Amino acid sequence: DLGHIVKTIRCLEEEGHIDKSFRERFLTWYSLRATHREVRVVKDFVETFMEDLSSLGQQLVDTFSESILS
Amino acid sequence: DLGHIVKTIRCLEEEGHIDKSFRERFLTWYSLRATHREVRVVKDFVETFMEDLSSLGQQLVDTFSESILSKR
């Protein structure tokens, strides 16, 4: 998920909620120094975010489909 | 709200849930044919996601600032 983690942090930062300095320090730390437990914990965060993000995708697709097909 | 919708769709794009066509197709509908209710529904879903991102933002910062900063 080393690509997935970049895409999550990027996503958070792109929409506000995280600043540039934190994103680049986070990704340096994640890639070089985070311990196996610390990588598990971040993986939970990204999984929560992936399920949040997918839910919203289905809402928007379903909203759009319902408006067109009705 | 529009900027939140566009940047959200990007976040959907990069993870590949959504097909390529959806962005232009959804934005054209959202901006040009969505009823007052459909527009409200779209903003409300996107605010509920923004609130998930804000909470997740703070939880990432609070949980890991020490481990990140301590190693310089």
Numbering used by the authors:
A (entry chain CCC): 532 to 601
B (entry chain AAA): 532 to 603
The authors write:
The equivalent double mutation of VEL1VEL (RK>AD) also essentially blocks polymerization. In a subsequent round of mutation screening based on crystal structures (see below), we identified four additional substitutions of conserved surface-exposed residues of VIN3VEL that strongly attenuated (R541H, R556D, L563D) or blocked (I575D) polymerization. As expected, the head mutations L563D, R541H, and T559E and the tail mutation I575D all reduce or abolish self-association without affecting the protein expression levels. As expected, these interacting residues are all invariant or semi-conserved, except for I575, whose counterparts are also hydrophobic in VIN3 paralogs but are typically threonines in VRN5 paralogs. VIN3VEL crystals also show protofilaments; however, these are invariably composed of dimers rather than monomers as in VEL1VEL. Indeed, dimers are seen in every single crystal, regardless of the mutant, space groups, or crystallization conditions. Interestingly, these dimers result from mutual domain swapping of H4 between individual VIN3VEL monomers whereby molecule A donates its H4 to molecule B in an adjacent VIN3VEL filament, and vice versa. To form filaments, individual VIN3VEL dimers either stack perpendicularly on top of each other in a “cruciform” fashion (in RR>AD) or they associate pairwise to form tetramers that, in turn, stack pairwise along the polymerization axis (in I575D).
The Arabidopsis VEL proteins are accessory proteins that interact with PRC2 to nucleate and propagate silencing at the FLOWERING LOCUS C (FLC) locus, enabling early flowering in spring. Here, we report that VEL proteins contain a domain related to an atypical four-helix bundle that engages in spontaneous concentration-dependent head-to-tail polymerization to assemble dynamic biomolecular condensates. The VEL domain adopts a compact globular fold, consisting of four α-helices in a quasi-antiparallel “up-down-up-down” configuration, each of which contributes to the hydrophobic core, as illustrated by VEL1VEL. Mutations blocking polymerization of this VEL domain prevent Polycomb silencing at FLC.
